[PDB]
């Protein structure tokens, strides 16, 4: 069985490379961040532009929704994170503490905490309510490419150009595990699976891998795409077939069967690297976003 994603909408408006796209957990919205220093909000089903959210002084590399779809957090080259109230557009808090670009960010499932990763080689954990940094983890020896909480928020996974994925105890800040395979290419992305059992990691040797976190071993590898340079997001698609989704440096979106590792579809249309993809939480919808020569977001829909 294979999905049938087809281009439904192309979303224009960002004036520089788009850096990330994320669907709100309630399925109503798509948020995008960009090198143009802006966040844009779009209708998830119709692609219709909603609003722009501004305030960062330099480009944004990442943006993430709170569990209730009310808040966003953005990570910027201006070395801050900002917490936004989506409905009012207000910047609630500016998170200052990183000494270099903030590259990646996420709320915990409770959305009382934010985790961030930076070019300063650290992972920081912030209180959402106060904007105060609670812990600084000396996580890596190179820029941190991705940070993500597991299902109950007790663990943080981080990845880095240093070639490592590390798993941290949220409460204690202790490094519980370091994961690396037979080679040491930069790790460009990481995230826990929906059930919290696995870790999906991208490396800059054209490879995605599914890790059993508890056993500390690679279970599945997904190849066929091009990823040697950019920190491209990857997703678990769970609304229809169980797929792995990722952008690629050949300007395509790749979709693999999670279990069999076979490529099942490739989506063509972008004119630059697909840096970011997101999977709608209830509909078979994929959002894809591309870099500077393209500047657009595309919405694809399947009868899976």
């Amino acid at each position: 069985v294979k999905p049938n994603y087809a281009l439904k909408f192309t979303l224009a408006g960002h004036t520089k490379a788009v850096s990330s796209v994320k669907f709100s957990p309630n399925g109503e919205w798509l948020a995008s961040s960009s090198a143009d220093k802006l966040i844009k909000i779009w209708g998830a089903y119709d692609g219709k532009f909603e609003k722009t959210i501004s305030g960062h002084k330099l480009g944004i590399s990442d943006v993430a929704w709170s569990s209730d779809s009310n808040l966003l957090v953005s990570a910027s080259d201006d070395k801050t994170l900002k917490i936004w109230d989506v409905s009012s557009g207000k910047c609630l808090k500016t998170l200052k503490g990183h000494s270099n670009y903030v590259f990646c960010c996420n709320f915990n499932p409770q959305s009382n905490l934010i985790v961030s990763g930076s070019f300063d080689e650290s992972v920081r954990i912030w209180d959402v309510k106060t904007g105060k940094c609670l812990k600084t983890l000396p996580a890596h020896s190179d820029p941190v490419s991705a940070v993500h909480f597991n299902r109950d928020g007790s663990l943080i996974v981080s990845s880095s150009y240093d070639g490592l994925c590390r798993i941290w105890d949220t409460a204690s800040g202790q490094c519980l595990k370091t994961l690396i395979d037979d080679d040491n290419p930069p790790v460009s992305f990481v995230k826990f699976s929906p059930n919290g059992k696995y870790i999906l990691a991208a490396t800059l040797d054209n490879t995605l891998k599914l890790w059993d976190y508890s056993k500390g071993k690679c279970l599945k590898t997904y190849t066929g795409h091009k990823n040697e340079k950019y920190c491209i997001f990857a997703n678990f698609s769970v609304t229809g077939g169980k797929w792995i989704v990722s952008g690629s440096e050949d300007n395509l979106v790749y979709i693999w069967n999670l279990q069999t590792k076979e490529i099942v579809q490739k989506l063509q249309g972008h004119t630059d690297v697909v840096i970011s993809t997101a999977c709608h939480p209830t509909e078979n919808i994929i959002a894809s976003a591309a870099l500077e020569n393209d500047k657009t977001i595309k919405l694809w829909k399947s009868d899976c």
Binding site: K16, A17, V18, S19, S20, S34, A35, D36, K37, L58, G59, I60, S61, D62, S76, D77, Y101, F103, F119, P143, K229, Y230, C231, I275, L291, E292
Partner: peptide
């Protein structure tokens, strides 16, 4: 414009 798009 941003670290991620620079790669």
């Amino acid at each position: 414009g941003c670290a991620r798009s620079e790669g």
